[PDB]
Amino acid sequence: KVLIDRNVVPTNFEKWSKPGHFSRSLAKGPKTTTWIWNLHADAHDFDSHTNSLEEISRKIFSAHFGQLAVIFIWLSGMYFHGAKFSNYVAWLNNPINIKPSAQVVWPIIGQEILNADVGGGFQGIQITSGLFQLWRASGITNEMQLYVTAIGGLFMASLMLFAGWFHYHKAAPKLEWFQNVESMLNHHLAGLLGLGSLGWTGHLIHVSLPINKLLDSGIVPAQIPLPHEFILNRNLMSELYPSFNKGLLPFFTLNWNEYNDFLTFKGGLNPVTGGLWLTDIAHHHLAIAVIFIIAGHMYRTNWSIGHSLKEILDAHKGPFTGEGHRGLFEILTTSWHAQLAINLAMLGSLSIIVAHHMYAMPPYPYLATDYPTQLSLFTHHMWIGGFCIVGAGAHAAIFMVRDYSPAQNYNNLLDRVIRHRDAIISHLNWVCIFLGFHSFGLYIHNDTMRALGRPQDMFSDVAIQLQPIFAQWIQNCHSIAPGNTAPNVLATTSYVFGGDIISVGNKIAIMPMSLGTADFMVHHIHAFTIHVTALILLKGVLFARNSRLIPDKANLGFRFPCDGPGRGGTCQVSGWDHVFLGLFWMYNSLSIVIFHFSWKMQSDVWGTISSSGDISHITRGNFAQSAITINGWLRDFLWAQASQVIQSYGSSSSAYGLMFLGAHFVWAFSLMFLFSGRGYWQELIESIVWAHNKLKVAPSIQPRALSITQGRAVGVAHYLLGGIATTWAFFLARIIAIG
Amino acid sequence: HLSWVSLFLGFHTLGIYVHNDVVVAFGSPEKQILIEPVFAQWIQAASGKALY
Amino acid sequence: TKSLSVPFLERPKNLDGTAPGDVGFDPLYISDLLDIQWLRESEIKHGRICMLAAVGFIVQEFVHLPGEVFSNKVAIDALFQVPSGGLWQIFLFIGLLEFVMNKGKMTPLDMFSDPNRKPGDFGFDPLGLGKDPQARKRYEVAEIKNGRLAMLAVGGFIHHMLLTHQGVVEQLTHFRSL
Amino acid sequence: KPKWSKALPFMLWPQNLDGTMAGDVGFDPFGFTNVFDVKWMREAELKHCRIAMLAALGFIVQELWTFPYPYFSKVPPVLAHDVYVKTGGMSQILLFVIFFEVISLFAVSQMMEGKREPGVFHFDPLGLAKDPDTFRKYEWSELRNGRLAMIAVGGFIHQYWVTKQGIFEQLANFRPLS
Amino acid sequence: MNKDLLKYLSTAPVLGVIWIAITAAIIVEFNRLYPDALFFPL
Amino acid sequence: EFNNLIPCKESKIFNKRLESTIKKLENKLSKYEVGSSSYLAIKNTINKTNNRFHKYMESGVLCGKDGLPHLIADGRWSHAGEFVIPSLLFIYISGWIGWVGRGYLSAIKNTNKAIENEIIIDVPLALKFMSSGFIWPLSALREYTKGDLLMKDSEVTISPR
Ligand code: CLA
Ligand code: CLA
Ligand code: CLA
Ligand code: CLA
Ligand SMILES: CC1=C(/C=C/C(C)=C/C=C/C(C)=C/C=C/C=C(C)/C=C/C=C(C)/C=C/C2=C(C)C[C@@H](O)CC2(C)C)C(C)(C)C[C@H](O)C1
Ligand SMILES: CC1=C(/C=C/C(C)=C/C=C/C(C)=C/C=C/C=C(C)/C=C/C=C(C)/C=C/C2=C(C)C[C@@H](O)CC2(C)C)C(C)(C)C[C@H](O)C1
Ligand SMILES: COC1=C(OC)C(=O)C(C/C=C(\C)CC/C=C(\C)CC/C=C(\C)CCC=C(C)C)=C(C)C1=O
Ligand code: SF4
């Protein structure tokens, strides 16, 4: 049922000049600079503003439209820069020998040096977002199509902004509407995902397939018919894919094999572009569309048929788990934080899956041999995933403090987890120590043995071997699967598992990735860093409400600095403080993942092939022997590969040199916040305030040092920005020079 | 006053270094701010350094 | 409630129709941002300078002082030809005038501190032309209207000279289009 | 008000169209005035009306006559846009449109505060509607002519893009499509 | 102009950004028209 | 004195820097077609570079053995433009900002909106103060001698000692 209240909130600027109107605590106005920071920190903490779940839900729904508007403006900007300020068309004509660029700088204070020589007569910043490859796969062949997409984006942005306003101020849904989770799932599965995938199949078959087939055969872009020509003149299509002569009769009569020319199961890669076959991508999306449209008929809405989510959950209980999933349905229909926690965990995990899948099965034409794009996309999507996972921990902890009740959770799975939190955390503590010693300890062994002139005592491929035999065995299964356990597939899902060296131009797109001792060792580092990040976040959640040290922790809240210097000292016991610490470990963990990727690809995958067939890798296979000591990482990775960024001054890569130094600065500045405390700073401010009072220039809003918690927040935010931007600059300067 | 002198030195010393980095990075070392240490050179001359 | 000169806008609160030159013209409501007394003083002063400057531009095309330094019949070019030391003497003398005329009260905070101080009124009427109250009231409006006109004229004169590098009259006699 | 829309007998009269304004025959099927203020929409309607009417007449007169100088020189109206962007003539028109629109910013804000009626600038130099009844009559004509001109201009520009003929060139020949 | 809107335009961050942007523009425009002033020319 | 320095117009290293910079730009220029936007951009950089080097040559700024301008900041008037004149300009501007800001702060303290007017500026009041900054040196000097600049030590809070 549609349930709404009309004309709820007037539209005027009255409250815009009343900062902190939304909070009882903040509405009174500042006495102190602390108020200014609190205003920003509390702006989107909607459940701290009101107790009404209906009011909270309405703000959220409307804020979501706001986010979508922002995303459409950003998307529109990308298309517009493509149309107006790029070498897209030139690249379209000669994609092997032109670098993509869609940002051009104005000539002020000498910055026009940044307009690099990217080819096609063009000068601009070389982009690594993969937009050109995306647009090629979509069948876009001219700037007019980009312009029109940009305009459509501005229209969508305005429509989202209207809907946000409308659904808050004019027609706000009632709580009962939001709690229709069965209806929401049916629509998001069948409607959003199902019809989305079906719609995209439609584009693929009717636009992408023909245009890309003509491009790959070597037809000049300007000589290719416009998309609508393929729709109106079926003969144009049937020339390329003969099954179009038979029309839609095979579909309705279940003679689907007739369409096996444009719906394929090839595997491998297009040899011309080094990307997945678009006929496979078309079939993928059709299959996905069918499964999703069926999936979205599972739940009961307005008719007798379907499942109750509550009934499913309530049935799943066994002899080890008490009341089982009883009470979870109530949690997940009354707590936005509980929903956010799950959804961040999955969205983050998915981003990480996307990183891996896109490098190994490159879905776009000319992606694989655009090394800057491959490196950028993997790295970007790994970071987004990491941040989302830490967010899941934050919102799981906020739920435990604010939304958990004992009465709702009597002897269910949630209750039973917290009743053995000591067993969980103690074991995770142990597994982290075990992993730490038997992963990082092996590198230290190796450093020591090599320094002592005992290479024969090292863990290495040529001494004491640690072969990843299980991974090696899986690689073999995947390489022999085509025509066996996958009989109707022609080639491997990925050449990373084994098989041919695919090359485009004379650049290697993808080839088998051998796994040896160096690969075994770095995989156990990843296991280690992920387990520790989990430890910190899990501990935050399970001890959010109380511990042996602080029995009433929940009353202190989610975000508080400590409970004083007693009981030995209680700094950083809060759930928030576990997120703080978890961010550093996520940073540590993902830094090593992207370093592993960068080095392994350059050493063992990327490079040139001769006509004879002699592979020349970017770092010449040094990974196996260098990546088994810390000295090898310091010297052969950091020191060696930093040569590009560090020698960039006076060239078009000079921006990266500047960002590299700037990012080192922001990182170091973070340490001022992390290592100090506000007692020092508040005292310093007292002397400075004395000088202002003396000269009759002291503010009425009294200066305060940052709160204890804000000090920590500022510290970790500068640590991450500095740390991540350093690697960004390092990576881009390097890969743009050699790739 | 110690706070003032520290801020004064900090803002301007870091500032000049960053001016110099940006202008050298964009390929114009001739735009650098380069102050001769003439007071120290004068003290060297007072002890008999002829160079200056 | 409406402006007289812009009839679709509410009258600016500080324009009461009393001051000379007031037809309620302030569509950007500048008289709400800035002090009206200071604005009025500034308007008259800009006007008086531009009245002199307009006459200056013309007379300098024909009449000159002795010497090749005080030649040049284009006024904007004459600025860079004449002795720089002379321009400093004018500047510093204007500075002294500004200080004395305003009795050392030279900012919006203090210029109208005395209640008797009125915008533009320095008590300068040697010949006693404004002895008659009624005539003086007319002259107050004429001063402002002529000042306003001279401001726009001098704006022209300058931009015309930048475009042509000819005198005011030279351009009219030898009118060359764009 | 008449309950059922006059223009659409199968639809209710829009809730926020009260019947009193000129042009109102209950035509708002998409329900814009449910969410947006009618005063804002009418302000916009009349601005489009008045710009279009000037445009319609401009297209007509430009094809029948131009000013007798080579700077002008007959071209098709649609092409003239790019001609006079280059000369700077189009920037001149933009200069004074900006000026009037920045002023209008204050007019529109005061309208939304209820101090001004949509479309009113009190502009009637010749005094053609001193009587209320003639004014209301002319309100309807302004809307009707303005609404017509809005579409008409759409015709002119599109038909040119297709036919590559002027308004009167096309009426002289009138060749059908393929 | 609407008083509530004008009050919003008077808030510290809005005036902060506008004023810094104008100042920044002035410096940019000086350097665009008179570039490379290492010293006062005299 | 400054025997370790030389005028930049007499410097062979300074001239070689011009030559080498231009030579690089002309190589970059040869990659593009005459008349193209890229070509014109590089030409503008060449002109701007030439203008800069010639400006410094005609100025009488001294050059080191590196062939780069070195500035003298000891007070001698033959190098006034290198530091003293910029310094006076900075002090005049910075003193203005400080003085008008101090004036605004004091004005709002004499109201009921002492705190509100810090986060929501009274813009008319602010512009009045900002407009009055041009004689801040004299204002500040008179305020000092009047005894209105400073509070007494006994009227400002201090901690225990
Ligand atoms: C168009 C005019 C308009 C007006 C006059 C109002 C007026 C109001 N809104 Mg509404 N609203 C609107 C449009 C409007 N809204 C739109 C388009 C949406 C969809 C997002 C909403 C959704 C909405 C919600 C969910 C809520 C309101 C609320 C309110 C009230 C308080 C607003 C306030 O004080 O914050 C002023 C805040 C701003 C000016 C900042 C907004 C920032 C925008 C959204 C994003 C900026 C882009 C990006 C982040 C910039 C980054 C820069 C970069 C450097 C990082 C006020 C009555 C609140 C209320 O309490 O009512 C009872 C409330 O909870 N509105
Ligand atoms: C690179 C690392 C770093 C930097 C830059 C600073 C900087 C500073 N420290 Mg800190 N400190 C550090 C590490 C650092 N510290 C560490 C590791 C510790 C151990 C915990 C401390 C402990 C410490 C103590 C105990 C004290 C200081 C003090 C200071 C100030 C000294 C005076 C000065 O230089 O003013 C000049 C200011 C700077 C150099 C700061 C940066 C200015 C930036 C670059 C301006 C950028 C503006 C620009 C428009 C960009 C805006 C960004 C945008 C997002 C808005 C200065 C703010 C002292 C102080 O406060 O004296 C008054 C003081 O007592 N520090
Ligand atoms: C209010 C002052 C004003 C001024 C000084 C200008 C000045 C100009 N206009 Mg602009 N213009 C204005 C208002 C103004 N315009 C207005 C209100 C509009 C309506 C939007 C326009 C629309 C417009 C267009 C479409 C074009 C211009 C062009 C020009 C330029 C023509 C150059 C030329 O060769 O002149 C030659 C002049 C003559 C042969 C003498 C003509 C004499 C007339 C009467 C003008 C004198 C008017 C005077 C300033 C005030 C009253 C005089 C008095 C006798 C009553 C010139 C820079 C043109 C351009 O850009 O050229 C490149 C152009 O195409 N203007
Ligand atoms: C009108 C504002 C004003 C004035 C006159 C002063 C004056 C002073 N400050 Mg203070 N200060 C200010 C604002 C101001 N400050 C603000 C906003 C901050 C927070 C960043 C500080 C933080 C600060 C520190 C940490 C220290 C001083 C110190 C000093 C003294 C030495 C000079 C200095 O080091 O400045 C340095 C100050 C800065 C670099 C901060 C930036 C100043 C901003 C740009 C001014 C803001 C202007 C304001 C927004 C204008 C609005 C006016 C308008 C509404 C009319 C001097 C008494 C020092 C001292 O005690 O020496 C004895 C000292 O150590 N100030
Ligand atoms: C070099 C030398 C020569 C000597 C040069 C010598 C004798 C000539 C000196 C000329 C002087 C006396 C002219 C005086 C210049 C008068 C000025 C231009 C007045 C400024 C008025 C302002 C603009 C008032 C504005 C304002 C008013 C309107 C209103 C107030 O409220 C505000 C202020 C802002 C004050 C020669 C001739 C021998 C030739 C030889 O070959 C070389
Ligand atoms: C209601 C009504 C019905 C009418 C309904 C019907 C569908 C109405 C739809 C009319 C629309 C489509 C008009 C569209 C108007 C199009 C606009 C006006 C185009 C602007 C072009 C610009 C202005 C060019 C700029 C140019 C470009 C882009 C680029 C530059 O280089 C050159 C210039 C030159 C500047 C009926 C029929 C049933 C009858 C009944 O009685 C009631
Ligand atoms: C334990 O860690 C720390 C603290 O406590 C937890 C601190 O407190 C501080 C000190 C830092 C403070 C007080 C924040 C600095 C904030 C700024 C720069 C002031 C903001 C001022 C304005 C917006 C006005 C300026 C106006 C314009 C430029 C327009 C530091 C360094 C710290 O390590
Ligand atoms: S040191 Fe800080 S965080 Fe730790 S107990 Fe004391 S006040 Fe709390």
Enclosing H/E stretch for D94? helix D89-112
d(CA A45, CA A48): 6
Q: Please judge whether E8 and A109 are an interchain contact, meaning their C-beta atoms are less than 8 angstroms apart.
A: no
Cα(F83)–Cα(F17) distance, integer angstroms: 25
The span from the CA of F114 to the CA of F129, in Å, is: 16
Instruction: List the structure tokens of A733.
Output: 């300067």
Distance CA A734, CA A595 (A): 13
**Three-state SS at F70:** strand
CA A444 to chain centroid: 32
Phi first, then psi, for residue A6 (nearest 5°) are -105, 145
Rounded Cα distance between A115 and B32, Å, is 22
Distances (CA, A) of A256 to A248, A249, A251, A286, F80: 10, 9, 6, 12, 87
DSSP designation for A507 = E
> Of A427, A423, A403, which Cα lies nearest the Cα of A544?
A403
Mutant choice from E10, E22, E26, E27 vs F, greatest count of F C-beta within 10 A: E10
Phi then psi for A297, rounded to 5 degrees? Answer: -110, 20
DSSP A637: I
- Sequence-ordered alpha helix ranges (H) in A614-677: 623-626, 630-632, 640-641, 643-646, 654-675
Provide the sign of the torsion angle of the four alpha carbons A675, A677, A683, A685, taken in this order.
Answer: positive
Q: How far apart are CA C120 and CA C101, in angstroms?
A: 10
- Which pair of structure tokens corresponds to residue A32? 């102190």
To test ligand 4's pocket by mutation, which of F102, F108, F120, F136 has the most ligand atoms within 8 angstroms of CB?
F102
In a 3-state reduction of DSSP, which class is residue A12?
coil
Q: In what order do the strands lie in the sheet with A507-510?
A: A502-504, A507-510, A607-609, A615-617
Residue with tokens 């008929």: A297
What span, in angstroms and rounded, lies between the C-alpha atoms of A370 and A507? Answer: 9
Measured CA to CA, the distance from residue C146 to residue C160 in angstroms comes to 20
- Alpha helices (H) in chain B, listed in sequence order: 2-25, 38-46
Distance CA A187, CA A293 (A): 9
Alpha-carbon distances of A339 from A537, A564, A599, rounded to whole Å: 17, 33, 38
Question: Among all residues of chain E, which has the CA nearest to that of D104?
Answer: E1
Report how far residue D3's alpha carbon sits from residue C177's, in angstroms, rounded to the nearest whole number: 64
**For ligand 6, atom 6: residue with the closest CA:** D151
Non-local CB neighbours of A434 within 8 Å, separated by 6+ positions: none
Count CA atoms within 13 Å of residue D55 on its CB side.
21
Alpha carbon distance F147, F132 (integer Å):
21
Segment A454-461 long-range contacts (CB within 8 Å, at least 24 positions apart): A458/A628, A459/A517, A459/A521, A459/A628, A460/A517, A460/A518, A460/A624, A460/A625, A460/A628, A461/A516, A461/A517, A461/A518, A461/A624, A461/A625
Residue A401 phi/psi, 5° resolution?
-80, -45
* Rounded CA separation C144/C21 (Å): 6
The contacts of residue B46 (CB under 8 Å, 6+ apart) are: none
Q: In whole angstroms, what is the distance from residue A377 CA to residue A689 CA?
A: 49
Residues A392 and A569: beta-carbon distance below 8 Å: no
Structure tokens at A514: 């051998």
Sequence-ordered list of residues with C-beta below 8 angstroms from that of C96, at least 6 positions apart, any chain: none
Q: Is residue A267 within 8 Å of A493, Cβ to Cβ?
A: yes
Considering only CA atoms, which residue is closest to atom 49 of ligand 1? Answer: A70
Q: Chain D residues with CB inside 8 Å of C8's CB?
A: 107, 116, 120-122
Q: Which of C81, C87, C119 is nearest to C102 (CA)?
A: C119
Orientation of helix A517-542 relative to helix A371-402, angle to 10°: 30
The identity of residue A677, as a single letter, is G
**Minimum-distance ligand to the CA of C91?**
5
Chain B residue nearest residue E36, CA to CA = B31
Where in F38-150 does DSSP place strands (E)? 62-63, 69-70
| Sequence-distant (≥ 6) Cβ neighbours of residue A677 within 8 angstroms | A708, A711
| Closest listed residue to residue A733, CA positions, set A18, A116, A26 | A116
Give me C68's structure tokens: 């090749």
**What dihedral do alpha carbons A52, A56, A59, A65 form, nearest 10°?**
-140
Is residue A599 within 8 A of residue A584, CB to CB? The reply is no
Element (H, E) at C171: helix C168-173
Torsion of CA A467, A471, A475, A476, to 10 degrees: 60
Q: What's the rounded Cα separation, in Å, for the pair F47 and F35?
A: 16
Using what technique was this structure determined?
cryo-EM
* Residue A307 to residues A195, A211, A304, A330, A614, Cα–Cα distance (Å): 22, 44, 9, 16, 60
Crossing angle of helices F136-146 and F84-109, rounded to 10° = 60
Helix (H, G, I), strand (E, B) or coil at A614: coil
Q: List the structure tokens of D70.
A: 């080579």
Closest residue by Cα to residue A52 from A344, A336, A391: A336
Ligand 4 pocket mutation, candidates A37, A681, A692, criterion most atoms within 8 A of CB? A692
Instruction: Please tell me the distance from the alpha carbon of residue A368 to that of residue A271, in angstroms, as a whole number.
Output: 11
Residue C107 has its nearest CB partner, among F123, F124, F131, at: F131
How far apart CA A120 and CA A90 sit, in angstroms, is 5
* C132: CB partners within 8 A, 6+ apart: none
3-state secondary structure D19-86: CCCCCCCCCCCCCHHHHCCHHHHHHHHHHHHHHHHHHHHHHHHHHHCCCCCCCCCCCCHHHHHHHHHH
Tokens 């425009």, located at residue? E29
For chain D, how many residues are written?
Answer: 178
E strands present in C3-147: none
Query: Dihedral angle at the C-alpha atoms of C42, C48, C53, C56, nearest 10 degrees?
Result: -160
Cβ atoms of residues E40 and F85 within 8 Å: yes
Asked whether the beta carbons of F68 and B34 are under 8 A apart, the reply is yes
> CA dihedral defined by A15, A19, A25, A31, rounded to 10 degrees?
-140
| Nearest ligand (C-alpha, residue C54) | 5
Which contacts (CB < 8 Å, 24+ apart) does range D72-75 have? Answer: none
Documented resolution in Å: 2.2
> How far is the C-alpha of A518 from the C-alpha of A629, rounded, in Å?
9
Helix (H, G, I), strand (E, B) or coil at A459: strand
The helix (H) or strand (E) run that includes residue A508 is strand A507-510
Name the residue in chain F with its Cα closest to that of C29: F124
CA distances from A718 to A36, A468, A595, A624, A710 (A): 20, 38, 21, 35, 12
- CA-CA-CA-CA torsion sign (D139, D140, D141, D147): positive
Q: Is A562 in the pocket of ligand 8 (CB under 6 A)?
A: yes
Residue nearest atom 15 in ligand 6 by C-alpha distance = D154
Instruction: Say if CB C4 and CB C24 are below 8 A apart.
Output: yes
D9-40 residues labelled b (16+ CB within 10 A) or e (exposed): eeeebbeebeeeebbbebebeeeebeeeebbe
Please state, as a whole number, how many other Cβ atoms lie within 10 Å of the Cβ of residue A396. 24
Instruction: Single out the residue of D78, D83, D84 nearest to residue D164, CA to CA.
Output: D78
Up-side HSE of residue D90: CA atoms within 13 Å toward CB?
Answer: 10
C-alpha–C-alpha distance, residues A9 and A359, integer Å:
49
- The residues facing A150 across adjacent strands are none
| CA–CA dist C74, C55 (Å, integer) | 13
Rounded to the nearest angstrom, the minimum Cα separation between C2 and chain D is 10
| Structure tokens belonging to residue C111 | 């210029």
Q: 10 Å Cβ neighbour count for A368?
A: 31
Say if residues A326 and A412 touch (Cβ distance below 8 Å): yes
